[PDB]
Structures are given as structure tokens and as C-alpha cells.
Amino acid sequence: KNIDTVREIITVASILIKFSREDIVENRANFIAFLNEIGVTHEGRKLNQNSFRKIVSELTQEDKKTLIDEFNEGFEGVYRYLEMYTNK
DNA sequence: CCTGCATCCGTGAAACCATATGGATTATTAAGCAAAGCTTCTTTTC
Numbered sequence: 001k002n003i004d005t006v007r008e009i010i011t012v013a014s015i016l017i018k019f020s021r022e023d024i025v026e027n028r029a030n031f032i033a034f035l036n037e038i039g040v041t042h043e044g045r046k047l048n049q050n051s052f053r054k055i056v057s058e059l060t061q062e063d064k065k066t067l068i069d070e071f072n073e074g075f076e077g078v079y080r081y082l083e084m085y086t087n088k
Numbered sequence: 089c090c091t092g093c094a095t096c097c098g099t100g101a102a103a104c105c106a107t108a109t110g111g112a113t114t115a116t117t118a119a120g121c122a123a124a125g126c127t128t129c130t131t132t133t134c
């Protein structure tokens with residue numbers, strides 16, 4: 001379904017903020033322009049801000065859990081250091 | 089002067105005035121923004 005399109009969204013976000021290029025995620029319209037030029041596609045077309053908030057909105061809680069769990073896999077070296085000093 | 093004793097010092101187990109002043113705080117406004125809502129094009133139904 002659309003869940004796979006969201007998977008490529010967060011994966012491109014993972015590469016994007018992983019390679020020290022941050023400022024293009026927090027602003028939204030330029031980010032959607034970036035996603036449209038790299039050629040992601042939900043239902044045969046480009047991405048609208050309404051369409052973006054729908055596809056983020058129309059979404060299941062367990063799938064969201066799956067997406068953040070998949071997202072945390074690249075950022076493992078940060079989290080091991082993060083929790084090694086919090087084992088109280 | 090140099091051999092010979094003493095010791096002793098270390099060492100561990102008040103109030104105000106005045107005057108700037110600028111930095112800190114508050115108000116005030118332009119920008120912007122997410123969310124909503126027209127307007128037309130497809131898409132699905134009988």
C-alpha cells in the first residue's frame with residue numbers, strides 16, 4: 001500500500017540527515033520539491049502538501065511502530081553510546 | 089678545625105547621591121503558516 005511509499009520517504013530522510021545535510025528536512029516545501037525531483041510517486045503522480053499530510057495521516061499505529069523501528073536501525077552507533085551512560 | 093654531643097625540624101603510621109547606560113525586558117508589528125475551503129478533472133456506479 002502507501003506504507004511502502006512512506007518507507008522510501010523515511011529511508012530517503014535517513015540518508016538525508018545521515019550525510020550531514022540537515023536543513024532540507026525541517027523546511028517542508030523544499031523537502032517535497034527534493035522528493036519530487038528524485039522521483040518518488042504515490043498513485044502515479046507527484047507529492048502535494050495535502051497529499052503528504054494525508055499519507056502521513058492515513059496510517060496505522062503498528063505500522064508507525066514498524067517505521068520508527070526500521071528507522072532506528074541505521075542509527076545504532078548513536079544509540080549504543082546514548083544508553084551506555086544511562087544504565088542507572 | 090674538627091671531632092663530638094644536642095636538638096630539632098621533617099616524616100610516615102555606612103550610607104547616600106548622582107549619573108550614565110546599556111543591557112535586559114517588554115510590547116508591537118510584519119511575515120508566515122498550517123489548516124481550511126472553492127474549482128475543475130477524473131473515477132466509480134447503475
